[PDB]
Amino acid sequence: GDRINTVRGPIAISEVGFTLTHEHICGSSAGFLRAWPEFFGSREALVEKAVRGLRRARAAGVRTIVDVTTFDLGRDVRLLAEVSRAADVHIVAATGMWLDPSLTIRMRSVVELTQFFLREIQYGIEDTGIRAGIIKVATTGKMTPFHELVLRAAARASLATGVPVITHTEGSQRGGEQQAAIFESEGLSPSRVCIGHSDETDDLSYLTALAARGYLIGLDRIPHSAIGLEDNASATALMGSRSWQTRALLIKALIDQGYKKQILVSNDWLFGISCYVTNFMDVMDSVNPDGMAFIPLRVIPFLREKGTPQETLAGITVTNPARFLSPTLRA
Amino acid sequence: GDRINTVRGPIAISEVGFTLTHEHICGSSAGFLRAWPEFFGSREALVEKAVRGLRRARAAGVRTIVDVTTFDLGRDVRLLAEVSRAADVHIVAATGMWLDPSLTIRMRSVVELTQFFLREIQYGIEDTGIRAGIIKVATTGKMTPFHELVLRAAARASLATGVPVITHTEGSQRGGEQQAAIFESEGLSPSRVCIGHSDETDDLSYLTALAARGYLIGLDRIPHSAIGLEDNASATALMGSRSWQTRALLIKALIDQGYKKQILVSNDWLFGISCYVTNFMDVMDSVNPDGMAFIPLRVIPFLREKGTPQETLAGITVTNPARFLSPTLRA
Ligand SMILES: C[As](C)(=O)[O-]
Ligand SMILES: [Zn+2]
Numbered sequence: 001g002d003r004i005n006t007v008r009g010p011i012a013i014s015e016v017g018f019t020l021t022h023e024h025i026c027g028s029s030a031g032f033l034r035a036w037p038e039f040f041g042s043r044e045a046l047v048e049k050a051v052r053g054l055r056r057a058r059a060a061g062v063r064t065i066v067d068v069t070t071f072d073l074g075r076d077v078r079l080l081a082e083v084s085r086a087a088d089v090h091i092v093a094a095t096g097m098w099l100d101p102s103l104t105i106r107m108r109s110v111v112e113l114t115q116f117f118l119r120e121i122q123y124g125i126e127d128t129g130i131r132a133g134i135i136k137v138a139t140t141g142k143m144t145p146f147h148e149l150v151l152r153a154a155a156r157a158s159l160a161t162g163v164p165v166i167t168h169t170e171g172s173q174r175g176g177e178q179q180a181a182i183f184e185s186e187g188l189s190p191s192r193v194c195i196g197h198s199d200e201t202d203d204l205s206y207l208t209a210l211a212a213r214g215y216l217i218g219l220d221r222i223p224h225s226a227i228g229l230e231d232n233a234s235a236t237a238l239m240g241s242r243s244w245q246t247r248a249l250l251i252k253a254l255i256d257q258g259y260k261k262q263i264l265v266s267n268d269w270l271f272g273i274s275c276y277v278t279n280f281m282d283v284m285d286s287v288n289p290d291g292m293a294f295i296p297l298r299v300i301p302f303l304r305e306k307g308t309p310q311e312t313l314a315g316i317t318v319t320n321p322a323r324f325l326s327p328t329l330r331a
Numbered sequence: 332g333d334r335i336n337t338v339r340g341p342i343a344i345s346e347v348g349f350t351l352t353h354e355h356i357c358g359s360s361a362g363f364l365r366a367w368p369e370f371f372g373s374r375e376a377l378v379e380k381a382v383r384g385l386r387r388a389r390a391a392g393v394r395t396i397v398d399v400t401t402f403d404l405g406r407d408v409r410l411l412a413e414v415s416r417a418a419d420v421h422i423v424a425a426t427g428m429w430l431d432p433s434l435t436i437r438m439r440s441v442v443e444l445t446q447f448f449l450r451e452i453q454y455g456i457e458d459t460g461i462r463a464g465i466i467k468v469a470t471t472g473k474m475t476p477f478h479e480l481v482l483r484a485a486a487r488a489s490l491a492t493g494v495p496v497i498t499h500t501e502g503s504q505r506g507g508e509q510q511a512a513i514f515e516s517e518g519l520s521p522s523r524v525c526i527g528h529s530d531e532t533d534d535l536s537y538l539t540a541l542a543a544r545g546y547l548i549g550l551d552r553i554p555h556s557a558i559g560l561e562d563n564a565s566a567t568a569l570m571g572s573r574s575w576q577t578r579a580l581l582i583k584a585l586i587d588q589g590y591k592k593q594i595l596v597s598n599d600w601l602f603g604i605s606c607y608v609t610n611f612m613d614v615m616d617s618v619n620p621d622g623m624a625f626i627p628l629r630v631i632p633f634l635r636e637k638g639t640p641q642e643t644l645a646g647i648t649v650t651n652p653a654r655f656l657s658p659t660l661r662a
């Protein structure tokens with residue numbers, strides 16, 4: 001593909017560097033940041049926080065993040081462009097659809113959703129000219145008809161553009177298998193797909209079977225381990241009860257099984273969030289003060305201590321995301 | 332007190348004139364018009380259609396419309412301002428919440444929703460400085476805890492500002508009675524409330540009892556009818572099988588019952604819609620080519636034919652809306 005679209009324009013593959021492939025500047029809902037910025041203190045305060053957060057990730061080695069905030073998660077690409085410029089960190093914007101499609105979206109056909117995704121990749125997002133460089137989709141539990149529709153639209157937009165697909169799953173129901181079956185029915189190469197939130201499960205058989213088929217495995221919620229918060233049923237029912245080390249050890253397990261080229265690692269962090277309880281951002285920041293720097297500051301050294309060679313870690317953090325993000329109709 | 336907030340700024344109540352109190356420029360979902368304007372052909376084409384349509388209504392006597400498109404219906408206050416100025420027709424913008432709140436909205440408390448509505452009334456919508464002049468809310472036949480939350484927030488916003496409330500109801504389920512009960516539980520005078528979509532039911536006992544308590548009765552979907560479109564299931568499901576004359580006769584029925592002062596008449600029209608089936612705008616336009624001018628060009632002469640005095644009609648189309656829309660504080 002030779003070049004990747006970012007919120008500051010196209011960049012060469014060689015410029016991508018250390019990449020976090022599943023992040024958010026702000027997790028919200030369509031139109032919300034514009035309608036009630038004071039929910040986040042102010043837009044200015046959100047930008048300031050995000051710029052500090054990205055600058056800290058940059059100092060820990062990160063050069064690119066993939067912001068997988070979709071339309072229905074309130075993606076504001078102008079926000080992304082501003083914080084990318086100030087922090088000097090590449091940001092890849094997303095199209096696709098998460099779990100909260102509005103009535104307008106829920107009424108659309110597979111053809112119409114394909115056109116929408118293609119618009120955001122080929123023409124630009126809103127009136128900004130910023131083009132999406134990834135397609136993000138989400139399913140939960142048992143595949144609904146609309147979920148299937150979004151997955152087929154995602155596959156078709158990927159096939160038309162070479163841009164990869166990244167998914168939200170909820171590993172407990174092995175949602176990746178359902179997603180894979182739909183993607184393959186559309187003729188999509190598994191090498192264009194990252195099955196994400198895969199660190200939510202300890203089922204290594206499930207993960208290795210997907211990697212064997214050629215899928216990228218997104219181990220992308222490593223710091224979302226709320227092991228001291230049982231009094232907080234909200235944090236418990238959204239973060240879980242396994243430690244971050246246990247999650248991180250899945251990375252090593254997959255490396256040990258021979259699948260280092262299939263692994264993508266990230267934090268799934270953000271600097272503001274409105275789509276859960278008020279001040280849930282404070283709860284998250286309390287559990288993981290490192291923010292997006294958690295992967296480079298904590299997880300990479302942890303894997304290095306466990307015997308993972310430097311070259312393998314560089315492969316996972318630099319080579320795999322570059323190969324994944326580079327638009328490809330092959331192979 | 333004697334001035335209403337419009338998308339072009341405050342205007343004296345004496346300038347309001349022939350008013351349609353339940354209308355839309357565009358029915359959509361949050362952020363959608365900005366993300367995929369091509370769904371409507373283009374933003375420019377939507378503006379052209381709306382300005383033309385509004386101009387036709389202006390020529391037929393209409394001076395003001397109340398656009399009760401909310402945040403979740405994809406209200407675009409900049410669209411409203413542009414079309415208001417070009418058609419030279421007053422437009423009152425809405426705050427509140429309809430039936431499609433996103434995840435962020437669904438997670439908010441009664442206090443938070445109150446603050447949101449108050450922002451849009453007291454400060455302005457988004458970063459435009461354009462203030463809302465009506466609070467629009469909606470519940471289903473069987474009201475949820477979230478619906479009740481929205482109604483209480485609406486009542487508290489109305490009490491703090493004097494701006495009135497308009498509701499969407501399932502009139503067939505006598506929705507006004509459950510809404511009125513919580514409105515009154517918050518101390519809100521009924522004269523601040525229009526129970527909308529009341530022409531959906533022919534239960535005159537229901538309508539007259541609400542009218543008798545001092546509620547406004549929105550007979551606001553008069554041209555909506557799928558008569559002669561029985562092979563179109565989506566048309567039938569939304570527009571219904573009752574004739575426009577049937578709906579219009581409810582206006583004369585309430586007049587004859589002595590409640591001409593409680594009647595607000597409108598079209599519930601729009602010039603674009605994305606929150607239903609594709610091209611449904613074409614279906615609506617084929618049913619009512621007159622658009623927002625249907626009420627002056629078809630309904631008013633119909634009622635005259637049926638013996639309704641001109642004076643009664645002038646009072647319904649001009650005096651009632653002025654009294655309703657004018658901000659009223661105490662009691
Ligand atoms: C916005 As999420 C918690 O599904 O990565
Ligand atoms: Zn996710």
Ligand SMILES: [Zn+2]
Nearest residue numbers: 023024068268
């Ligand atoms: Zn995420």
Ligand SMILES: [Zn+2]
Nearest residue numbers: 499500528599
């Ligand atoms: Zn309605």
Ligand SMILES: [Zn+2]
Nearest residue numbers: 354355399599
């Ligand atoms: Zn309406």
